[PDB]
């Protein structure tokens, strides 16, 4: 249980072994501060530093969860699929939470690099203590950092202009990694080497912090996982329309606009999250905002603009993210009618899009672009392509449009597939990978049992291929190159064909656009979705006018 | 030795001919036997008349004149098959002699049973192909009909039927209403079906087969209130009564412009055709009044008459009698249209590439607002976006666009139609073209590449219009597309009669043996896939297809 200090006093931990031979010991720093409680006149306003401590601090225990309410309000179609199937565990992680919850968690193993994860979703649940850091540290020799940061009703609140500038939530996190870039060499890791990754939401936050000059020697190396700053559900731009009914569900709805936020500064926070204010589908209620301050414009003016560090990119995608776009197809057999079809890619177009010529032309193209005609009677092969047209147009063509962009700038980019997942009973046959179902890769579960959230079966590939990904992402931290340092070398569990041995990631550049193909049988492909991708980057564009 | 079968209006006599092969038996020829009063006085834009009936014994020994053209002039080259573009000069000799008088067809009469071993007369199909690339020009007397009719044991027989302003010209008028070639056609049908017996035809199993232009005409023919009793099967090679060019929706129009060229037009329109009678068949003809790209000018009309309706029109409303069908498109059709751009060696330029989209979309539809949206998406639809850098990709594309839309597409549709009403169709698509010289290595088979296959050229050794080395593999191919057509004027079923064998060749294993060819439905587009390697297999171009007959009606 060591001590270590940082410029604001000192702080404890905790050994742990690991009860597996090739993972080693690891000391857990869970719940030091790093930005002082924001209650009262602290909300709805930017943190600062933290409290300094004279004596030392008991941080061997994990902190309090941000101000959430799990059940009710639901985003279901947003949140890691493994999130919805199990809310029963998932609020286990929530229960004690308290407006006091800017914290942060450090997973040490004993200049090494340290990897900064933002959790999330959608924006409004979620907290660090739900990743249990441990694996991947004492596997990667990395230092693994999971965080709490403010949500959503709390902590990205805003109206139209100055009363309520918003994204606090994010500032949090910047706040985090410049508590970060000051402290972690202290507990044995060099700060020229902090990674950011996150999925879902917090993939799309990792995208935008890429993007906003609040944070410039802060990281170096970027992680987006099935997420980015120009997704439908990313950023919101309709702040105030849901901000005023919030206010006027509590009793804060002034005419001004600098009145409303300073009743809102009074009103409990159990009370003030707990409200069943939802956005319109596919968008969101509380989140990032255009405020000309943290987020300078709409991300998309900003990429273009190019004024962002040449950080060292990874981003990539699930093949069937939008599993849960197809939910009310799983007792179907017959698969989707045409009827039902033509039906949900309607009021798809409806719920994104909604002007004329667009309206009706709009519509009836990208139907002909998802169905396969070589077999168009065929429910369940109909079933798949709904699910790959949701799954195309948040994710696939997002990430791709993103990925290229940078790599204009040469920004160095490494473009993922993931293609394979744990069955998980509870889930179609055709499941094959659903949004955030590479978490437990990624966090090396597989390695140690199946925890509360990730429950199945994991069998001994499912342990090779968690080992696989660790490596490429970890080396992606030292790095900025997932090939090296540490070659796909597995036969330390299996000697089994290590099916990863000679395959070279190679960068994901704008005319050639390889990627990794991530799975049972991995390559490097040239263009993923090739076609499905430029309908919807070149094709649809036109079809406004 | 010469012949003598006695017709419904005199005797004929023609010479017997041996053909260029051992396994091939002799061939009795009526050359340029009539089969109407020629077309001449006020006869000229009239329907035909029964031929006249003469006393003593008539000479079909000789070739018969070809119907009034300008091969020198009157260019609709991109409708026009490869091979003839390609040999004008050669093609040119077989209409060196013209006449207005020329209605007449030619027969093909066998000997034997097909093929031979080196070592009670029953009735013959009857085969009548319907020549023509544009409308304009041909003359059945290119197609030696002998090597068929002698391989398949079928009467093999042509015609020449007026072309061009005498053929077509129309006021949609009584003045004229023009369609004179198809009921030329018709009245050849009449002829064969009342005096083939004679020769020995069974004129319960005529078949009418042609090939681009001449293929229209037997869509055309299986839709006219014209054609009933006389044929029963009809064989579709690259052509379709709803192509841009199968029918002319503007007579007057080029009728006008015309008239206007020889000082005959007038305000009323009798006055002004009667006018026309007035003129020579080669002041009338040679006269360059040019269609609108992708058109003909003197063509087919819809004249409620012969062409009922919009064929469109007719088929979706089933307004046509059951006959057997045989519908195809070759690989790689609109080899021409890339031709602006062709042999440069680096592709198509991109920059190239949308401008020839752009012209594609003004010509074919351009009315224009839709236009917008309607060119970018079918941009989207021919670039392929796996490398959208190699020309190479864009000039095959850019080949297909027009391939797709002036010959599949129709086709697919016409196959759909015809067998929702019950006609069974047979499907084929052809992958395969002879090394032609001095055409490209990207030469996949273009339009009309298949006749020389179906005439069975490669038997008997290239001749001055089909001029390219046929391999042993040409010659089996030829045998099997042959062995294929005959069992269909045979059974209305390709694979019917007599079987696949190419043992008169070395022991390749006959590919085709193995395949048995599905009729086509509209629900599984089942299609033989006609090449070196064939398979059967179902929906052709599937999402091109879907796209111009789903998507585009949409998208305008
Ligand atoms: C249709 O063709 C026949 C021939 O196939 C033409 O009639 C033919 O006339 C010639 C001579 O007038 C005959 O040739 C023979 O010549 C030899 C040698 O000099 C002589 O020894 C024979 O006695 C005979 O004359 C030929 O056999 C004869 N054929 C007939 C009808 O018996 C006829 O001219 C052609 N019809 C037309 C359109 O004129
Ligand atoms: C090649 C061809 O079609 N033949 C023509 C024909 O009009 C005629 O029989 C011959 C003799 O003058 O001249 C040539």
């Not at 199937?85 to 308290?98: F, K």
């Not at 997420?227 to 005419?255: F, H, M």
Request: overall charge negative; some cysteine.
């Amino acid at each position: 249980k060591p001590v270590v200090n940082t410029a604001y006093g000192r702080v404890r931990g905790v050994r742990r072994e690991l009860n597996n031979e090739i993972l080693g010991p690891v000391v857990q720093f869970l719940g030091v501060p790093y930005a002082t409680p924001p209650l009262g006149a602290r909300r709805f306003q930017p943190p600062e530093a933290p409290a300094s401590w004279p004596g030392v601090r008991n941080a061997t225990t994990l902190p309090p969860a941000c101000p959430q309410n799990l059940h009710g309000a639901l985003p279901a179609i947003m949140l890691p699929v493994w999130f919805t199937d199990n809310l029963e565990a998932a609020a286990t992680y929530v229960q004690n939470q308290s407006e006091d919850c800017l914290y942060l968690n450090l997973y040490v193993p004993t200049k090494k690099p340290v990897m900064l994860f933002l959790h999330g979703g959608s924006y409004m649940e979620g907290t660090g203590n739900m990743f249990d850091g441990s694996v991947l540290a004492a596997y990667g020799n990395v230092i693994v950092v999971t965080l709490n940061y403010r949500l959503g009703v709390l902590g990205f609140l805003s109206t139209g202009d100055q009363a309520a500038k918003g994204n606090y939530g994010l500032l949090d996190q910047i706040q985090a990694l410049r508590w970060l870039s000051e402290n972690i060499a202290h507990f044995g890791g060099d700060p020229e080497r902090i990674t950011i990754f996150g999925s879902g939401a917090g993939a799309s936050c990792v995208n935008l912090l890429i993007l906003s000059h609040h944070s410039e020697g802060l990281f170096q190396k970027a992680i987006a996982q099935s997420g980015t700053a120009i997704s439908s559900w990313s950023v919101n731009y309709q702040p105030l329309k849901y901000t005023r009914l919030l206010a006027a569900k509590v009793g804060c709805d002034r005419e001004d606009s600098t009145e409303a936020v300073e009743c809102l500064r009074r009103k409990s926070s159990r009370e003030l999250v707990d409200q069943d204010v939802q956005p319109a589908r596919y968008h969101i209620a509380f989140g990032p905002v255009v405020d000309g301050d943290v987020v300078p414009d709409d991300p998309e003016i900003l990429m273009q603009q190019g004024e962002f560090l040449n950080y060292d990119m990874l981003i990539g995608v699930n093949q069937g993210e939008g599993l849960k776009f197809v939910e009310d197809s799983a007792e179907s057999e017959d698969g989707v009618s045409a009827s039902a079809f033509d039906f949900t890619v309607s009021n798809f177009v409806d719920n994104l899009y909604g002007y004329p010529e667009g309206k009706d032309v709009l519509r009836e193209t990208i139907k002909f672009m998802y169905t396969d005609w070589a077999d168009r009677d065929n429910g369940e092969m109909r079933r798949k392509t709904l699910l790959a047209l949701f799954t195309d147009h948040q994710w696939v063509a997002p990430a791709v449009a993103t990925a290229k962009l940078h790599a204009d700038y040469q920004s160095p980019v490494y473009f993922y597939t993931f293609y394979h997942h744990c069955q998980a009973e509870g889930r179609p046959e055709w499941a094959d990978a659903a949004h955030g179902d590479e978490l437990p890769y990624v966090f090396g579960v597989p390695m140690v049992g199946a925890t509360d959230l990730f429950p199945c079966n994991f069998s001994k590939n499912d342990v090779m291929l968690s080992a696989v990904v660790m490596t490429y992402w970890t080396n992606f931290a030292k790095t900025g190159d997932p090939n090296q340092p540490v070659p796909q070398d597995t036969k330390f569990i299996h000697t089994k064909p290590n099916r990863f041995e000679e395959v070279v990631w190679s960068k994901f550049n704008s005319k050639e656009k390889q990627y990794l193909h991530i799975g049972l049988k991995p390559r490097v492909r040239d263009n993923y979705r090739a076609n499905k991708v430029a309908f919807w980057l070149e094709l649809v564009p036109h079809l406004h006018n």
